Amino acid sequence: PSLNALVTGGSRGIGEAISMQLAAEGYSVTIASRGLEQLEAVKAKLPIVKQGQTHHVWQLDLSDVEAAGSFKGAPLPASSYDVFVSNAGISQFSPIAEHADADWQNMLTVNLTAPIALTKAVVKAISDKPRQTPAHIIFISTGLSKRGAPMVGVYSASKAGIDGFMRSLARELGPKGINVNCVSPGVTRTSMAEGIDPSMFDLPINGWIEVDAIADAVTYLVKSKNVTGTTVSVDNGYCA
């Protein structure tokens, strides 16, 4: 009964929270990102609550679309996964006129192109497997994909892309028993919010969101059966 979950960006931040909660719920968590020693440290702290439950690391750089799509170096085959949380990502703030090409192109690759490739691999491997209860693909998006802001043009594009991907995959994959959703965080207390503050946004709830709140939404989704094609916004009201 321990099912496998793949969580990109599980070495820190929201992805580590997500991985922690899924482990406490009995999932066997594969965490994937670049920083191998950090992934090892997280893996060693993920709880073990069920017989058979095993956690894994995958050193994967999402700049490398071919590696992502081919499950290069992955500890388990793509066919093993019942849950895929696409959480890794990069944010860059710049006027579009001054945004260095190597940077925004890299961000688009990590945030959109590599997730497409990973999703394709997982879907190919699991579409026709029999299941009692739905598999789950969950993308971590951002309030910025739905409400525009200055200086985040390509970032917003990348995540809006994910949202459109999600909607269409939900329609495609519902009849195969795969449910597909986004969780959309607001300003969360992670390294990604170094140099920004919740007060620069027009927020109904004026403060920081903890990583726990984002993982709570993921856990809600993974436990659900009738939710697909949607976003769950955990954003202190930003998109209101």
Place this chain on the structure above:
Amino acid sequence: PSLNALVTGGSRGIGEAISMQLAAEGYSVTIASRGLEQLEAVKAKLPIVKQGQTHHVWQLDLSDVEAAGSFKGAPLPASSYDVFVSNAGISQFSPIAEHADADWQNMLTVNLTAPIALTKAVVKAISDKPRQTPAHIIFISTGLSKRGAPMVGVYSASKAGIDGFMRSLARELGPKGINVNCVSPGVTRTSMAEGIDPSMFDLPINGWIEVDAIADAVTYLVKSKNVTGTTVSVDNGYCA
């Protein structure tokens, strides 16, 4: 520690399941609707898990806006509530041209005007009360408020109105420590599904939604603190 939750339409269907789950979580639930025999029956089954937790019935016809706004006959004052779930509603299916005025006007009053008056009362009563964590106002909407369909003009209008109200209230009330959201069901196995069935719709997930799936989303929201101004859709991909 037992907080008070008001659930309109708590005597059957989705409202019964929401009441059962809030009660399991420790809330003292007041259920409000017309049918006194059925309200007493549900009250008797609501879980008691915390010392001091007690449930209540309120015989209330939401076509009487003045009774609703003044908490006429209520067991507790509006000031007592930390959760209000506005669930009661009527649905009518008709070409607009043939929709009897008395019918659509009563549906608009139950589904939108009465919830505005209830919400006013609660907000006036609780806005300045000190709270450690936010109070919750949660409206039960429908997929039809976001994606149009034939023969549901006024039903859609009433629930889209609720949505609009929700988003403005979330902006207004966030600084007062009240979070406001909608949960949007799809075609769920209730008395309202005399008339319609999941096959009439093009659904990513075929089949009926059970009432507890809708209540799961309400439960998730009540336990959250960083979610406001949103819809949680539990619709089998209807709005995807």
Place this chain on the structure above:
Amino acid sequence: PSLNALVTGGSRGIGEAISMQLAAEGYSVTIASRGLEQLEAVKAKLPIVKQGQTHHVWQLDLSDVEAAGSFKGAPLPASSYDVFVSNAGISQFSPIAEHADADWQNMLTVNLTAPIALTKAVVKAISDKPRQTPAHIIFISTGLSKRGAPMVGVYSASKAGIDGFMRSLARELGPKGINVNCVSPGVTRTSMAEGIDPSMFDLPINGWIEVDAIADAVTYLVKSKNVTGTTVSVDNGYCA
């Protein structure tokens, strides 16, 4: 060949501008609102650009749902109309807790209930008339129906309800040759914006919108035949 258009709130503001543009385009315009002498003054100024074109006035108080729904006092029967622009409206700013019941209830009736009744009457009268090109039903909404703000709960709910109504009517009436849309103004230089200012909002385009710009969107829609179920937002980027 002068087609007939009905514009509620034609006596000043947006509705006057809409009436002026449709008259310059050759429509025979019926302007409806409470101020009969004001309506007569506007009708006397509406351009006459071809033979057969005639304008008309309707003294109509949208607080009276039955008068609206029966076309009481209308100069032409509902069957005469090819274009219906639902423009008249009231806005009220208040904290929900302090919003006087007679005021918000009247605003809900003028902005939502009366328009449903007018729309029913028109649809009943023209649904089965043969048409070479589509008839148009166009509601004037507001950016606040899509992006929440404080102090506008019931105003927002009324206009969001119009949006929901529009989307369902577009689905119901497209196969009958009636296209149904909204135009959504932002802060426009009318009597409604006395005491507010474009600067209170967080606008990409920081200044006033002239009533001409709203009318231009209505003109575009009335000449269109493949646009239905949509909002055309003319809001200086409010909803961006």
Place this chain on the structure above:
Amino acid sequence: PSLNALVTGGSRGIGEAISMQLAAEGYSVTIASRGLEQLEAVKAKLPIVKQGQTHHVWQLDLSDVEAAGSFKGAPLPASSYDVFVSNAGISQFSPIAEHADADWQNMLTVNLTAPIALTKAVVKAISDKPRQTPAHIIFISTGLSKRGAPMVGVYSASKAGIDGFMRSLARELGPKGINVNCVSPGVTRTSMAEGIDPSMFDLPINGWIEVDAIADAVTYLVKSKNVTGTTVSVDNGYCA
């Protein structure tokens, strides 16, 4: 006084229609795409209505991001443009599990990465230029960016990405006198719709949309000054 307009994909289909309309309105039109002889044929057919109006061709493959971002081979400097319509695009229908990588990657690049690069070049060149009325950037998106469908995962992602870009840029660039919007076509009678049919979709208006209808929305937007951050949907109801 002929303003310049850049139209990608101006050799056929919607882009040809847009170029024709802008040319009849007095714009000097640069049409850009791969097929040079086809471009020259269209340029020869573009109306000349005004002294000073000149049309131009640019051979540009949007699979080459560096070419696009550098204006390689362009007839005029990026600083010459008052209107940029990003219309070129590719659609591909496939189950995601079977969607060839070279195909979906090239689609993403032509639909999203290369328009980002072009936009960057235009914005850098014109941001600080003095203007009496706004410049316009217009992206051609699709109903599929907003309402999911099976077999169009990456296509939808690419266009939803453009929508997210658009909303961010509208916020960024509004204060610079640049308005930014999308036009969203439905099933339109072009080479992209060979194989697909309006009857495969659940349409309020069951028929083909002509290219003229899409161009009419573009024309409306180019003549507007208070519209930014929005989509104009010309989709026969698809998104309703």
